[PDB]
Amino acid sequence: SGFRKMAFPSGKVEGCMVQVTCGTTTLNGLWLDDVVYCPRHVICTSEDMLNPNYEDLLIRKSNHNFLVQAGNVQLRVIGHSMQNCVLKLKVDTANPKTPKYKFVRIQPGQTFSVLACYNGSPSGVYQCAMRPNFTIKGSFLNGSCGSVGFNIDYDCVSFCYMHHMELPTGVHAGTDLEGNFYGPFVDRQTAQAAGTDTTITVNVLAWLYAAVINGDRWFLNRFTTTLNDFNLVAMKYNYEPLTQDHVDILGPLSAQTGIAVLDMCASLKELLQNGMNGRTILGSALLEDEFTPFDVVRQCSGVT
Amino acid sequence: SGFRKMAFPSGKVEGCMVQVTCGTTTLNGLWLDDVVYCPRHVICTSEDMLNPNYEDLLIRKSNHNFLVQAGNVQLRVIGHSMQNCVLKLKVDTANPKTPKYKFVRIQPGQTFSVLACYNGSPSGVYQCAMRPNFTIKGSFLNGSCGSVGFNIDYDCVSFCYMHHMELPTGVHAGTDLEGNFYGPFVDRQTAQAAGTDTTITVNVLAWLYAAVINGDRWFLNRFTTTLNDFNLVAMKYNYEPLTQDHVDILGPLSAQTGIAVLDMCASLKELLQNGMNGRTILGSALLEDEFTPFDVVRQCSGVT
Ligand SMILES: Nc1cncc(NC(=O)Nc2cccc(Cl)c2)c1
Ligand SMILES: Nc1cncc(NC(=O)Nc2cccc(Cl)c2)c1
C-alpha cells in the first residue's frame, strides 16, 4: 500500500554522466559506448545564445576544444559531429559502465525519470511527464543542461530526453537523444511561449484507479458516462480528450478493480464539476496526471 | 527554476541490495562490508507473526538457513546475530561496491530517499519524511521489507531507515540500521494505531521559501506574526509548534529571499485560515511538508 511519485533507480544512468566543457561553458554529457552526447549549445557564449549559427560556431571548434571528464579522469576526444541540436563526441574509450540502451522519442503524456546533474555529477532524481504542450516541469538550474530523462525495462535504459533550456516561464524544453526538440522549441535565447498545458486525462484516470487499489474510494460515484459526454466536460476543463485507445490501455486497471473505465470517467467528471471540497486523493488535493497506466500497474505490482 | 520532490541518486544503494530468504520468507537485505542487514521477521512464517518470540524462533535457525543472493550469485553466511529488530548476517565476502557509510537515527520531520526493492532488486526510488507520529507514508508491497531509506553527503551514504511493516491504516513502520523501531511500533501482526499525523511546520515554511525563489509569490501578504501567535494557529491546524531552532534553521532561506521568518509565518497563518481558494503553490493544492530547509537549499543551489 501507498502510492508515491517514484523514479526508476538511477545507478545505470549515473554510470553514464560526464562533464563536458567548451570554452567557458560547462554542462553534462551522456557517455554511451565511445560517444558522449551533449547539447550543442555547449559551444555558445551567453552572447552567442541570442542568435547562434551553430554550423558556423562549430567550424571554430576542434576535438581538443571539447573537454570531457568522467569522474576525475579526462577522456580523449577523437571526433565530433552535430546531429540536430546535440553534439556527439567520439572518445577513445568505450564507457565500461554502458548499460543496454535505446534512444526513444516519447509522446506527450509519457512519464520518465530525470537524473539532474551538475558538472557531470548527479544531484538528484525525480519523475516527470512530457506535457501535452511538449514542455516538462522539471527542476533545473544553470549547469543542468545535458541531464537526461529515461525509462528502464528491467536492464535496458531507454533514453528519451536531454535537457537544453528553461523557457522564460520556468518550464523546460529539450530534445530526444537524436537531438530533435520535443515540440516547437529552438536552442536560442528568444521569446518562445508554451501552448496550453492541458491535463493528461488517461493519466488522471490511471491515478484514480491507483487510489481505489490503495483504499481511497470516497470519490467513487453511482454514475457512468460515455466518451463523447465525458470529452465535452474534459474540453471545458482543459483536459486532453480520451480516446478508445486510452480506454483500452486502462483495461487491466479496470479488470483489477472491477470499475468500468466509463464509470471512472463519470467519477472524474464529478470531481471536475464539484471540486475536491477540501478532501484529498492519495494525499493530493489536485488530480495527478504524471502517472501513466503502465506506471500504476508497475507500482501496484512491484516490477524491478 | 522548478521545484520537484527529488530523491538522491540511488546507485550507491543499488550496489548494496541483496535478496535474503529464510524458509518460505523472501525479503531484502543491505550488504555493507561483510554484513547483510535485514528485518528479523525474515525468520517468521505469516503464522508466527501473530505473536513471535524472536529469540526462540532464532534458535531453530542456522547460518545455512539464511540464503543470501547478490545478483545471481549466492553469498556464504558464516555468522548471524540479532540486534534489536534486525538480523546481521556475516558473509565471507565484503561487498565490493560498499560505499562510505554511516548509520544514523533521524528525527521526525527529516526527509530521506527510499529505494523500494523486491527480491533484492530495486524497483524505484522516492522521497519520504519521518512523520511526527514516527510512521512514513511509503509505497511498499509484500516483499519490500528490508528496503532502506538514506541520505547522501557527497559520497557518504547515511542509512536511516529499514522497512519492516505496513500498519492496518496503510502507513509504514520501520527501524534505524541498529534495528530500533522509529516510534512505538513492534514487529508483530497486532493492532498498532498511529498517533496524529501533524504537519511539519518548518518544512512547509522551507517549501514556501522555495516557492518564492521559483516565482510563486501570490500567497505573500503584508502581515507579520510572533512565534507564540503563530503557534496558537499551528496547534489548531494540527501543525507542529515552531521553535527558535526552526527559525534559526530557516535563516539562510530568509536571507536569500529577504523575507523574515515571522513574515513567512504570517503568510502561512493566512493560508491556513483562508485556504488556497483553488490556487496552487509549486503546482500543489496543499501545503507540502516533505522538504526540509536543507533540501530546499540543496535543490535551489545544485549540490551533487
Ligand atoms: N535555470 C536553468 C534551467 N535549465 C536550463 C538553463 N539554461 C538555459 O536555458 N540555457 C539556454 C538559454 C537559451 C536557449 C538555450 Cl538552447 C539554452 C537554466
Ligand atoms: N504491503 C506491505 C507493505 N509493507 C510491508 C508488508 N509486510 C508486513 O507488514 N509484514 C509484517 C506484518 C506484521 C508485522 C511485521 Cl513486523 C511485518 C506488506
Describe the model.
Two copies of one chain form a homodimer. The first copy, chain A, is an alpha+beta fold and 304 residues long. Chain A folds into three domains: 1-14 and 100-197, Thrombin, subunit H (Beta Barrel); 15-99, Beta Barrel (Thrombin, subunit H), CATH 2.40.10; 198-301, Orthogonal Bundle (main proteinase (3clpro) structure, domain 3). Chain A is built from seven helices and 13 strands. In chain A, the strands form two sheets. A seven-stranded antiparallel beta sheet of chain A has the order 5-4-1-2-3-7-6, with no helix packed on it. In chain A, strands 8, 9, 10, 11, 12 and 13 form a six-stranded mixed beta sheet that branches. Chain A is elongated and about 70 Å long. At the A-B interface, helix 1, strand 9, strand 10 and helix 7 of A face helix 1, strand 9, strand 10 and helix 7 of B. Residues 41, 49, 140-142, 144-145, 164-166, 187-189 of chain A line the site of one N-(5-aminopyridin-3-yl)-N'-(3-chlorophenyl)urea. It is classed as viral protein. Keywords: COVID Moonshot, fragment screening, XChemExplorer, viral protein. It forms a dimeric assembly.
